[PDB]
């Protein structure tokens, strides 16, 4: 375990996706609460938030 | 050119090594 950025780690656990139910979630460190639905707006290929 | 541009990211390489100098192989260089 050096000061260099980590490049190997353990795997993650992924679960099913749910919609129309305001529940808890965690995508890439982001945690909140609210309803989930699709959208018409489109992001840039590199942007993620 | 006098136009405007956007420099989107391409790739990130985490290596954690100190860099102080660079060298190439007409071109403009800024700081």
**For residue B16, what are the β-bridge partners?**
none
**Cβ–Cβ pairs < 8 A, chains A and B:** 12
Method: cryo-EM
| Residue A31 exposure: Cα atoms within 13 Å on the Cβ side | 2
Whether A4 and B15 lie within 8 Å, measured CB to CB:
yes
Tell me how crowded residue A25 is: count the other CB atoms within 10 A of its CB: 13
Question: Nearest CA of chain A to the CA of B26: how many Å?
Answer: 30
Determine whether the interchain pair A4/B16 forms a contact, defined as Cβ–Cβ distance below 8 Å.
yes
Cα–Cα dist A35/A18, whole Å: 9
Question: Which of A5, A44, A46 has the CB atom closest to B16's CB atom?
Answer: A5
Q: Resolution of this PDB entry, in A?
A: 3.7
Integer Cα distance of A6 and A12 in angstroms: 15
Residue A18 to residues A23, A25, B21, B26, Cα–Cα distance (Å): 9, 10, 51, 55
* CA proximity to A46, closest of B12, B29, B25: B12
SS3 content of chain B, % helix, strand, coil (to 5): 0, 0, 100
Tokens representing residue A22 in the block: 């305001």
Q: Can you read off the two tokens belonging to residue A21?
A: 């139910």
Q: Considering only alpha carbons, which residue of chain A is nearest residue B7?
A: A46
């Amino acid at each position: 375990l050096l000061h260099a950025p980590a490049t190997v780690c353990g795997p993650k656990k992924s679960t099913n996706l749910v919609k129309n139910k305001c529940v808890n979630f965690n995508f890439n460190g982001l945690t909140g609460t609210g309803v989930l639905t699709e959208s018409n707006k489109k992001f840039l290929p590199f942007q993620q938030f | 050119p006098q136009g405007f541009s956007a420099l989107e990211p391409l790739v990130d390489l985490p290596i954690g090594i100190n860099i102080t100098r660079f060298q190439t192989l007409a071109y403009y260089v800024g700081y």
